[PDB]
Amino acid sequence: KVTVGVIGSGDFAKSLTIRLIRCGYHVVIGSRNPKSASESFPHVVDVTHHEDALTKTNIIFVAIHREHYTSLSDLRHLLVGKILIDVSNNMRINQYPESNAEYLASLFPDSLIVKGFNVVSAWALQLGPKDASRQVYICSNNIQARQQVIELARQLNFIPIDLGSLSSAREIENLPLRL
Ligand SMILES: NC(=O)C1=CN([C@@H]2O[C@H](COP(=O)(O)OP(=O)(O)OC[C@H]3O[C@@H](n4cnc5c(N)ncnc54)[C@H](OP(=O)(O)O)[C@@H]3O)[C@@H](O)[C@H]2O)C=CC1
């Protein structure tokens, strides 16, 4: 089984982990408190500290909020070359001078940041997306990483919508707030 990483242990990390397992992946979780977080996951999931989880996979969902990204900054060297999937949303349209994905890319300039899955609710990961809204919008400045995340979306039974460069991340982040 291919191993996919998730940082964080909240509602989104838990739902993502469900879908990943159902779709045939092995999951490693990076948590600040893995002994405590382990009870929030099945035994088949490897729950560990961030620095250990990162050694087990090259593709990591960053299932934490933007305001906590800098808690990972000391992992910069270990994260070099890895794909980081920015799943985040904000409470306001155009909330910051840069999109959350661009902010993450600036914190980890030698990682490969891909925006994706922010439009998917926790409940949609558990039940599946509505038949008329299986779309997940994906973008990245790195074409190879973009294509890997597109293929992951397909394996998770979503319809990936390739919006090209990371410049698309801003309006992808605005989309849940628009109607
Ligand atoms: N909930 C949803 O339905 C959806 C959420 N998202 C996005 O997913 C991401 C997570 O959302 P959600 O699960 O609801 O968020 P939570 O508020 O549950 O936070 C998730 C994780 O953040 C981690 N973390 C929290 N504080 C810190 C910190 N100070 N430093 C380092 N890590 C920290 C915790 O992990 P730990 O304690 O294990 O370290 C926690 O389990 C967000 O970006 C959200 O916008 C996207 C679409 C849907």
- The string of DSSP codes covering 62-91 is E-S-GGGGGGGGGGTTTTTT-EEEE----S
Architecture of domain 3-177: 3-Layer(aba) Sandwich (3.40)
Question: Can you point out the beta strands (E) in the chain?
Answer: 3-7, 26-30, 46-48, 59-62, 83-86, 112-115, 135-140, 159-162
Tokens of 30: 């990076």
CA of 88 relative to ligand 1 center, distance in Å = 9
Does residue 53 line the site of ligand 1, with CB under 6 A? no
What are the residue ranges spanned by the domains of the chain? 3-177
Tokens for 78, please give them: 């270990």
Q: Which element (helix H / strand E) includes 16?
A: helix 11-22
Of ligand 1's listed atoms, the one at least distance from the Cα of 90 is: 45
Q: Give the integer Cα–Cα distance in Å for 150 and 166.
A: 14
Helix, strand, or coil here: 179?
coil
If we measure between CA atoms, which residue out of 68, 61, 66 comes closest to residue 32?
68
Distance CA 169, CA 136 (A): 12
Report CA dihedral (42, 13, 70, 103) to the nearest 10 degrees: 150
Q: Is the beta carbon of 10 within 6 A of some atom in ligand 1?
A: yes
